[PDB]
Amino acid sequence: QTSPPGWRELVPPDTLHSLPKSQVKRQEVISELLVTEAAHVRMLRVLHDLFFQPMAECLFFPLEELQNIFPSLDELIEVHSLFLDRLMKRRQESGYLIEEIGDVLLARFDGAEGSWFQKISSRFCSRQSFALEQLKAKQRKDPRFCAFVQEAESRPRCRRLQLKDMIPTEMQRLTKYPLLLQSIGQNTEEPTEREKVELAAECCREILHHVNQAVRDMEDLLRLKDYQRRLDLSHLRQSSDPMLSEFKNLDITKKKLVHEGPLTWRVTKDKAVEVHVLLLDDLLLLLQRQDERLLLKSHSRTLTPTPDGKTMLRPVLRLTSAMTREVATDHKAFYVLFTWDQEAQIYELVAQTVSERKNWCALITETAGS
C-alpha cells in the first residue's frame, strides 16, 4: 500500500499503447530503480531501528564491536535515503511518464557525491562476513540474544525481512545498479540525456569494482588479526638463533597476505609436520596448529634425537634470498632454498596436488624477487 506504485500500474492505457517498445522499457526500468530503492531504504531503516540501535542500548556487544558490525549504517541510510527523495521528486514532478533521469544518477554516483557514496558503501559491505559470523555465533550461544532477535523479527515493520538476509543486501544492490543503469541507457533516445546515464552507469561499475576489492581487503586483514591473536612467540623469544633476532616482536597485521595453504613440511626423512603456511609480502611463516593456537618452532634437521650441533630449520623465513624448485623425488612436493651470509639451507614442502605446488612456486618466486 505504502511502497510506491510501479508505473506499469498507473500509466493510462492510451499512453501505454501509443509508446515505442524502447520507451516502455525505459519507463519500466526507471520505475524498478525507484521502487527497489524505496524498498532498500525502508530495509536499512529497519535494520537501524530494530536491530542496531536496540542492541547498542541492551549492550550485547561492546560498542566498538557493534559499530564494526553495522559500520556507520547511520550514514548509509542517509546516502541512499536522500538519493530516493530525488527519484521521488522527479516522478512527482513528472506524472504519466518520466523523461530525463541522468542528472539524478550523477548527483548520487558522481565525483565527490560519488566518492562519498563509495566510501560509506565500502565501510558497510566489507565487514559483511564478520557481521554475519559474529551475529550467528552470539545468537547460537546466548539465548538472551536469540530471544532478542526473534522478538525483533516478529515485529510488524520486520515483515518479509530477516536479520541474516538484510546484511548482505547492500552488496547485492551495488550489483544491481550497473545492471539497471546500463538498461535505462540502452533505451534512452534523446542523445545528451543518454550520455549522462551511461556515465552514471560507469561510476557504479567502478564503485562495484572498488567495493569488491575493499571486501577481499577486510576478509584478509581480519584473517591476519586472527592469526596474530592465535600466535605463540615463546619459542622465538627463547631463541639465541640469529636468523630469528628480528622476530621477537612480530606483528603480521601490518603486512600484506599474499597466499596461504596447508602443507606438509618434511624436516627429515623421518619427520613430517603438518603446517599452515603464510606467504606474506616478504616473509614465509610455517605455522603449526596446536589446539586453538598457532605455533612457530624451529626443528632440528639432525634425524637423530638428539645429541646436537648443526643449525636448525626455521618457521619464519625472509624471502629476499629465496629460490624454488620442483622436488624430483616426489612430484607433489617442492624445495625452497634460502641463502644467508653464513649458510644455505633448504626446506621441503609437500602439497595436495601437482597443480598446487606449481602454484606456490610461482607465487614464491613472484613475491620474492619483487
What CATH number did the domain enclosing 163 receive? Answer: 1.20.900.10
Whether residue 14 sits in one domain with residue 161: yes
Whether residue 108 sits in one domain with residue 73: yes
| Structural domain total, the chain | 2
Nearest CA among 360, 284, 276 for reference residue 321: 284
Whether residue 299 sits in one domain with residue 264: yes
Asked whether 270 and 285 are in contact (CB, 8 A), the reply is: no
Whether residue 331 sits in one domain with residue 275: yes
Gap between the Cα atoms of 364 and 284, Å rounded: 9
Experimental resolution (Å): 2.9
Residues shown for the chain: 370
Whether residue 286 sits in one domain with residue 207: no
As given in the structure block, the three cell numbers for residue 84 are 530516493
Domain boundary among 177, 212, 233: 233
Who contacts 140 (Cβ-Cβ below 8 Å, separation ≥6)?
Answer: 146
Whether residue 222 sits in one domain with residue 106: yes
Nearest CA among 152, 119, 141 for reference residue 52: 152
Whether residue 275 sits in one domain with residue 144: no
R_g of the chain, CA atoms, integer Å: 28
Whether residue 170 sits in one domain with residue 307: no
Asked whether 328 and 294 are in contact (CB, 8 A), the reply is: no
| Three-state SS letters, the chain | CCCCCCCCCCCCHHHHCCCCHHHHHHHHHHHHHHHHHHHHHHHHHHHHHHHHHHHHHHCCCCHHHHHCCCCCHHHHHHHHHHHHHHHHHHHHHCCCCCCCCHHHHHHHHCHHHHHHHHHHHHHHHHCHHHHHHHHHHHHHHCHHHHHHHHHHHCCHHHCCCCHHHHCCHHHHHHHHHHHHHHHHHHCCCCHHHHHHHHHHHHHHHHHHHHHHHHHHHHHHHHHHHHHHHHEECHHHHCCCCHHHCCCCCCCCCCCCEEEEEEEEEECCCCCEEEEEEEEECCEEEEEEEECCEEECCCECCCCCCCCCCCCCECCEEEHHHCEEEECCCCCCEEEEEEECCCCEEEEEEECCCHHHHHHHHHHHHHHHCC
Other CB atoms within 10 Å distance of the CB of residue 243: 19
Domain boundary among 233, 263, 292: 233
Whether residue 160 sits in one domain with residue 17: yes
Domain boundary among 180, 206, 233: 233
Q: Which CATH number belongs to the domain containing residue 347 in this structure?
A: 2.30.29.30
As given in the structure block, the three cell numbers for residue 178 are 550497473
Grid-cell match 613472484, residue found: 366
Buried b (16+ CB within 10 A) or exposed e, 187-199: bbeeeeebebbbb
Whether residue 321 sits in one domain with residue 188: no
Whether residue 229 sits in one domain with residue 251: no
- Domain limits at 256? 234-370
Whether residue 152 sits in one domain with residue 13: yes
As given in the structure block, the three cell numbers for residue 121 are 558503501
Asked whether 276 and 262 are in contact (CB, 8 A), the reply is: yes
